[PDB]
């Protein structure tokens, strides 16, 4: 069946029809075909797939957020990797490139000319403006007005020129397409090379793509976080932040995800990098970064469980949300419930803690772990097998369920592995604080559980915590999935995960 691909401007349109022709000859009629849809911007492509006019289009990690938002509802299905085919990389470096001996650093960018890849882009907007956000003059909302006053002249593609003229001073109208002289990675570098801007925010591979001469490449410098300038070749040592790779998005329901990857897998094996001289998948004589990025070496399949918020991660999703809204004693701990009985005991615990601990229920045990990831949940109790799965996603355990009665239960931990309370990295301080006060009020008590509340007692058997637990012991060391379980247990559940694989474990291993 045919797959409608969305193309931006004339440049991507010409590469699309050429891609449709070259693929038609090598692949039979029974196989997949490629169709092309004309669109003015990337935003028009997202609205097209949602309206069933197109099927798939590649976007930047920072533009995936926009595609996730209702009523577009797009999920990343195929992600491209950079570097080499032997060693795939699902993340690229974002750096700031300036001219040699300019006399400006990372902390001093006010009243300076800037060149961005595009509004909403990872390396061109989300990161560069993100570090300088809480240093911007009031007000901070809207975001575009503060950048307009910070930089004397800027060129940020896909931006409203009528409301913010200063962001389209270097590039009139702010074109979202290749039709604009300064668009994307290669366009933002051309904004620096021509002498229009003082600083350009692009990728680490952008310099090598535009300049081939070794003498010409030493005419630039990279700004670091500690206000220092390091060599262009040294990008691993000096960079802003590591961002997720570009990915192709499709509809969550009925977005033929299995048909699109079946098309792109055959595209890289016939017209990929260093495969054919007639047509290249990651290179075009009409322009740079068309359809797919020139720095890409292949494609990789994105697990079904992994959604757009999971693809970017908590660290990046929160950064975008705070960048648009305007945000620079502990908050209630949202506990995750599995069954009807667990949330019934949770609701009674919520009232007794006086709003210190809330309750959010999920369908299965695996679904609760995903909620702690994006921020819907905060903490929950899990057995040793699930601690390995939660730990591989990025959740560290803080408390251990002790079944032995001792003098100092909270001071000394138990080895047994036992059930552990896992939580998000940023809530480590709060969870270990609030729950410790709850044990002093509802922990070990007399047979008065008929009148008063008892945390370690359930209506049936093992609800929020196990019934044979004395107290939840705090870990002295910062234990991870490997530190808590031990070197012997990790290898045990790892080999068992090979035959019995869950959807969440495969999704967290992707990154």
């Amino acid at each position: 069946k045919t797959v409608r691909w969305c193309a931006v401007s004339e440049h991507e349109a010409t590469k699309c029809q050429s891609f449709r022709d070259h693929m038609k000859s090598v692949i039979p009629s029974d196989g997949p075909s490629v169709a092309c849809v004309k669109k003015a911007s990337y935003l028009d492509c997202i609205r097209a797939i949602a309206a069933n006019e197109a099927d798939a289009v590649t976007l930047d990690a920072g533009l995936v957020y926009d595609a996730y938002l209702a009523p577009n509802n797009l999920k990343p299905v195929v992600a491209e990797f950079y570097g080499s085919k032997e060693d795939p990389q699902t993340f690229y470096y974002a750096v700031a490139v300036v001219k040699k001996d300019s006399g400006f650093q990372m902390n001093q960018l006010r009243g300076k000319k800037s060149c961005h890849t595009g509004l909403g882009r990872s390396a061109g907007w989300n990161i560069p403006i993100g570090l300088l956000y809480c240093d911007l003059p009031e007000p901070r909302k809207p975001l575009e007005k503060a950048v307009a006053n910070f930089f004397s002249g800027s060129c940020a593609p896909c931006a409203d020129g009528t409301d913010f003229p200063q962001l389209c001073q270097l590039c009139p109208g702010c074109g979202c397409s290749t039709l604009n002289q300064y668009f994307g990675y290669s366009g933002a570098f051309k904004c620096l090379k021509d002498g229009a801007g003082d600083v350009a925010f692009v990728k680490h591979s952008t310099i090598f793509e535009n300049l081939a001469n070794k003498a010409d490449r030493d005419q630039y410098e990279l700004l670091c976080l500690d206000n220092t300038r390091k060599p262009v070749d040294e990008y691993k040592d000096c960079h802003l932040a590591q961002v997720p790779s570009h990915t192709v998005v499709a509809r969550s329901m009925g977005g033929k995800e299995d048909l699109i990857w079946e098309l792109l897998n055959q595209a890289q094996e016939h017209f990929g990098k260093d495969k054919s001289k007639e047509f290249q998948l990651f290179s075009s004589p009409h322009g740079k970064d068309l359809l797919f990025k020139d720095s890409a070496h292949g494609f990789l399949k994105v697990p079904p469980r992994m959604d757009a918020k999971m693809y970017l991660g908590y660290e990046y999703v929160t950064a975008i949300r705070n960048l648009r809204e305007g945000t620079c004693e502990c908050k209630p701990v949202k506990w995750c419930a599995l069954s009807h009985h667990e949330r019934l005991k949770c609701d009674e615990w919520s009232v007794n803690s006086v709003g210190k601990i809330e309750c959010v229920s999920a369908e299965t045990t695996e679904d609760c772990i995903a909620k702690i990831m994006n921020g819907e949940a905060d903490a929950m109790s899990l057995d040793g097998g699930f601690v390995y799965i939660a730990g591989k996603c990025g959740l560290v355990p803080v408390l251990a369920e002790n079944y032995d009665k001792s003098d100092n239960c909270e001071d000394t931990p138990e080895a047994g592995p036992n059930h552990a309370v896992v939580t998000r990295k940023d809530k480590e301080a709060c969870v270990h604080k609030i729950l410790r006060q709850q044990q002093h009020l509802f922990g070990s008590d007399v047979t008065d559980c008929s009148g008063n509340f008892c945390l370690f007692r359930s209506e049936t058997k093992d609800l929020l915590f196990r019934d044979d637990t004395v107290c939840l012991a705090k870990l002295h060391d910062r234990n991870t999935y490997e530190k808590y379980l031990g070197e012997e247990y990790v290898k045990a559940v790892g080999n068992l995960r090979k035959c019995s694989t869950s959807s969440l474990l495969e999704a967290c291993t992707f990154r």
Binding site: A70, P71, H340, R343, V360, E376, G451
Partner: protein, 638 residues
């Protein structure tokens, strides 16, 4: 085109060039000097407000006329005298100028007892039984009608209201004051329905009407009565040393009230500014116009702010270029001294038209009484809208912002019957807000003939700066609610409100366990309400703000929370204040706790059959509100 910061500065610049004191002084002219409801002077100012609204070039300006019944002191003056055990003797105390509206009007005689404020708690502590005797109470803490209601319940024959020197430091002791004893809002002769000629005015009367005569007397007249009484008043009450407890066995008081009813025409005049995106949704800004006396603090300020906010916002639309997403209605209410009649009759008549269309009411009455502190009584949802405005508006006297107390939400007082915002929140289910630059002690010359412009200037020197600050707070409420496509109604706030109710009910967990009742269902009802707001908060996070359709589907769910708290089990005619948090009735949540307080004392006052029903409906009211908030009709669990 224009953002929040552009709007903040454009409003502030208009406020600096606006003269408030000149407007309040113009309303206190000899032409509008006395503004009794349905009087010539009331209509005169009404025509003035109509023309002024028409001069500001608003979208539409219309008037609504009602024919309501009020009570007035006619030919026969009311008198209070002391008599002997056999007949008329003693001496004539006073013939008051002032009176209490909607009084029984009957001649009564008997022993006199000081009930102090007249609070249900005050009566319970009285060592002297109030049964079959006239009670005298100080003005304050509560409503007159509340004062009378508490007395009538203990079988009192009548009620006398006076102002002590301690609470009311007034020089003149011969000064009389006005009030009303109707326990409710609106016209008491047209409950549930509007006072239009369409209803033909059928024979119907409100249950809130008192069955005993009520009269207000001066400080001097009270001291004359104390002279004939014996027994020193307890140090618990902050009152004068003249205060006496009961009359002697030889002499007792005789009160006679003879007020008659009068049919009058009330004019309610409105002004609207149509929105560009959703004109059908609107925020209402109301202000009282009528006053028994001169009314400078009661209605003088409020009406001045109403006219000026309607001016400033109209100039921002036409001249500046401000485009409100939702409409704004300015309302000049009449007959407010009689229990917010004009406003309640409008809500009772166009109830269907503003169902889920009106999302907020801002009240401008009594916004300026002092200068010490800033007090606001509103719905939980507007809590966050206020908090944000408090840390943005500076105090008129000092330099600091209004946001100084972090735990200000817990010190917020509930809306009372005398407030014009009460009918909007408890009857209609529209979140309302009433703010004040109040003082520690209430305004002394409030319901008196000394509510003049001169007295307002003397007490508040920098009146112009405080009125500008008042209009700035009210002005930012309008902006915030009509500027952004996202509603500023915080549904999240309420969870603290439900948690508070269940914690108070958790204290009596032993008494509930004794009966064949469990509390686990109320824990889930509360929990499900959190999960509903949490799901809605994430649903706002995963949606595009620029899209009109997705947002409207989400904002309509927010506009239903206040409605879903109105009890759907009680008749709106008999129990108009349906709201379960801030209403009056056995249906309300506080009443459920109050009824269970009688259980712990083991007396014959606790009704078990009533409590089992009270708990049943309230559990489902909170649950139903939770189920309707998120997950549609199939995504719900239980």
């Amino acid at each position: 085109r224009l953002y929040w910061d552009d709007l903040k500065r454009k409003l502030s610049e208009k406020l600096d060039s606006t003269d408030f004191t000149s407007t309040i002084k113009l309303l206190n002219e000899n032409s509008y000097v006395p503004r009794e409801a349905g009087s010539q002077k009331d209509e005169n100012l009404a025509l003035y407000v109509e023309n002024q609204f028409r001069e500001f070039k608003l979208s539409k300006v219309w008037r609504d006329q009602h024919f309501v019944k009020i009570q007035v002191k006619d030919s026969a003056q009311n008198s209070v005298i002391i008599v002997d055990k056999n007949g008329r003797l003693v001496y004539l105390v006073e013939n008051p100028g002032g009176y209490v509206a909607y009084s029984k009007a009957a001649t009564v005689t008997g022993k006199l007892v000081h009930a102090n404020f007249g609070t249900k708690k005050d009566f319970e502590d009285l060592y002297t039984p109030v049964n079959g005797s006239i009670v005298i109470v100080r003005a304050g803490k509560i409503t007159f009608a509340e004062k009378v209601a508490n007395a009538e319940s203990l079988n009192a024959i009548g009620v006398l209201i006076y102002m002590d020197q301690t609470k009311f430091p007034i020089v003149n002791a011969e000064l009389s004051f006005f009030g009303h004893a109707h326990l409710g809002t609106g016209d008491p002769y047209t409950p549930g329905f509007p006072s239009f000629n369409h209803t033909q005015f059928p024979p119907s009367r409100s249950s809130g009407l008192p069955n005993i005569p009520v009269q207000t007397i001066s400080r001097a007249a009270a001291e004359k009565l104390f002279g004939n009484m014996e027994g020193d008043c307890p140090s618990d009450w902050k009152t004068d040393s003249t205060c006496r407890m009961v009359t002697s066995e030889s002499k007792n008081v005789k009160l006679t009230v003879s007020n008659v009813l009068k049919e009058i025409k009330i004019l309610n005049i409105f002004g609207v500014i149509k929105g560009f995106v959703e004109p059908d949704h609107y925020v209402v800004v109301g202000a009282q116009r009528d006053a028994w006396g001169p009314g400078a603090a009661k209605s003088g300020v409020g009406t001045a702010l109403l006219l000026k906010l309607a001016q400033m916002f109209s100039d921002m639309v036409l001249k500046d270029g401000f485009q409100p997403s939702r409409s704004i209605i300015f309302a000049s209410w009449s007959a407010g001294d009689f229990g917010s009649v004009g406003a309640t009759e409008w809500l009772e008549g166009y109830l269907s038209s503003l169902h889920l269309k009106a999302f907020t009411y801002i009240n401008l009455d009594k916004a300026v009484l002092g200068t010490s502190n800033f007090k606001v009584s509103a719905s939980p949802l507007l809590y966050t809208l206020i908090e944000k405005t408090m840390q943005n508006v500076k105090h008129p006297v000092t330099g600091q912002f209004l946001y100084q107390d972090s735990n200000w939400a817990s010190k917020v007082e509930k809306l009372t019957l005398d407030n014009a915002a009460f009918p909007f929140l408890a009857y209609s289910g529209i979140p309302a807000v009433s703010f004040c630059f109040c003082e520690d002690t209430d305004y002394p010359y409030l319901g008196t003939t000394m509510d003049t412009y001169k007295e307002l200037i003397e007490r508040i020197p920098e009146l112009n700066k405080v009125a500008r600050a008042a209009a700035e707070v009210a002005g930012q409420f309008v902006i915030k609610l009509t500027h952004d496509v996202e509603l500023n109604l915080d549904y999240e706030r309420y969870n603290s409100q439900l948690l508070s109710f269940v914690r108070d009910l958790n204290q009596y967990r032993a008494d509930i366990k004794e009966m064949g009742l469990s509390l686990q269902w109320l824990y889930s009802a509360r929990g499900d309400f959190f999960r509903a707001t949490s799901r809605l908060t994430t649903d706002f996070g995963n949606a595009e703000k620029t899209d009109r359709f997705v947002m409207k589907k989400l904002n309509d769910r927010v506009m239903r929370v206040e409605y879903h708290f109105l009890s759907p089990y009680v008749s709106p005619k008999e129990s108009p204040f349906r709201h379960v948090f801030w209403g009056s009735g056995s249906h309300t949540l506080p009443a459920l706790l109050e009824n269970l307080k009688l259980r712990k004392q083991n007396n014959g006052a606790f009704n078990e059959t009533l409590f089992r029903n009270q708990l049943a409906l309230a559990t489902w009211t909170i649950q139903g509100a939770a189920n309707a908030l998120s997950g549609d009709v199939w995504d719900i669990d239980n």
